[PDB]
Amino acid sequence: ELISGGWFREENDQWPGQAMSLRVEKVLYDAPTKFQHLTIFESDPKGPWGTVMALDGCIQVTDYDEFVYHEVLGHTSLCSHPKPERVLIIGGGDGGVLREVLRHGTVEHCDLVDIDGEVMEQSKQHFPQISRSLADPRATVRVGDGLAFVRQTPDNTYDVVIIDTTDPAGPASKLFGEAFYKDVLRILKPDGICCNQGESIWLDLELIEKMSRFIRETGFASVQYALMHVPTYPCGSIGTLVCSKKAGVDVTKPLRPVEDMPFAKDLKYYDSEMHKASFALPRFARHINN
Amino acid sequence: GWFREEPGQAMSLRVEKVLYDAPTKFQHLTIFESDPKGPWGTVMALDGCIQVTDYDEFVYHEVLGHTSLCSHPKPERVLIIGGGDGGVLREVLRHGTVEHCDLVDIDGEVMEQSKQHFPQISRSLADPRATVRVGDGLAFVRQTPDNTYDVVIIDTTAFYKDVLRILKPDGICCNQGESIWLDLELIEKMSRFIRETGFASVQYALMHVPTYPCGSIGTLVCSKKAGVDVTKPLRPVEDMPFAKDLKYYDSEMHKASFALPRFARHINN
């Protein structure tokens, strides 16, 4: 029930005693969905953010910084794979990661599965620059639970799986869980790479340590956390765990540098120097990566 | 019960107790204990802008103090301009090569309040290798002879020529360098103006600071001497005996910090 000229306020128990607030210039969508609360608004036009999307009260995408996380998830993973022909996105309803994955000419086909069909609908309508990808004939966009999708996928189906979900607290709770990640390992081909929505070193450092140990133990050969700067996420950063099925692979140095591909100059955040830099963690977090 | 920092966006931390809140002769100083259920601890703000929190002050203090000193061949005489809380000084003093550090901050009330409410940061203010002055830094460098300092660190809220002049030929200057998200145009202008004033190289080092607006800040690392590549450590911290006492900075972070997002890379490359 947001109102134009009102303020949107983001607080949350997973981060007690801090809040981020954006003045609302224009409400575009604000309603319960089958699965979560979807809010879209145009932010103050004197500010840089543009249109904002929140899911259950938490900002997911803004026009001004959406390229960071989408470019990092899409390119760090695909530039770590020797020939990524078939790709799966779990979540990713807004289309950002799909847009970056489809930059790559090796990609033959990408499946995307998001549980909330209204997220796709609202992104088509209000984020055309993020959502254009969803209509690509190289994509198959499905509405469905990613958990069920992967359980019903045959062994060895994908080169890369990217898990672009919400918090562990919402409809995305088991996509930080155990039959799920074993399923991801199983549906990956031998040289398979997985990357996930990775949580913050400031708020979630214990979860990150736990996830990384347990991804390795379920049977991934290596797991390395890449940090990135996202100004609208709590505490200004988020990371992704980049995981290799195959042993002997060093994801922290690009296997297929983007500089050699024809779109490198269209990117606004990612390049090979940012890719390598993203695996250097502050000392207090470095034990994640060794 | 919230401290609000502010077009059309705000960032708030909940206040548990107000420790200090007065104008100073120079600026508005607010110090508070934040929500004990969150991590931030005691928080200091100046003119409505968060400057220091217990939880994350190590970042900016380690990056400024060590990025600069690890880029100098032998840093023995160091000047800090601003830095009244003590945190850059604490990092500077870890280095065995440092004979002496002068620190000059315009606001003595900041020093006083830091000794009172941030003792893990301001203990450094009473080190015998340090001299703390209360005074304007512009007037201080104007009155400093040529080739006085190996390193000048500008940790603030005719000058850059004075800085260039008071540095020795191998001198390194670093500053509080602003945000690539909020101030990108100012960073490009400053990086040109510092090169024009005479510094031979300027490179911006980016860092993750949760309590600064949009979660990052940076520092311009400027070398008086031509041909110096500050983006790789000249004297790696891993070879010094305090490397493991640090919570943020190491040689990998040093290198990484000069890798800028494509949209900002024209600052460095």
Ligand SMILES: C[S@@H](CCCN)C[C@H]1O[C@@H](n2cnc3c(N)ncnc32)[C@H](O)[C@@H]1O
């Ligand atoms: C919007 S995207 C996050 C913003 C960065 N692109 C988060 C998506 O994860 C979906 N999500 C959450 N749980 C699931 C499950 N179980 N399966 C698939 N997609 C999911 C959710 O509907 C969002 O669209």
Ligand SMILES: C[S@@H](CCCN)C[C@H]1O[C@@H](n2cnc3c(N)ncnc32)[C@H](O)[C@@H]1O
């Ligand atoms: C708080 S410190 C920055 C916080 C990260 N340690 C910023 C200091 O710079 C001082 N400052 C501001 N202007 C000047 C001048 N002109 N000279 C010296 N010190 C100054 C100001 O009083 C703050 O204490």
Ligand SMILES: CN(C(=O)[C@@H]1COc2ccccc2O1)c1ccccc1
């Ligand atoms: C620590 N901190 C933040 O993370 C701010 C506010 O809380 C947020 C919550 C959700 C997203 C982004 C947020 O940015 C901060 C607090 C006060 C001042 C500056 C920074």
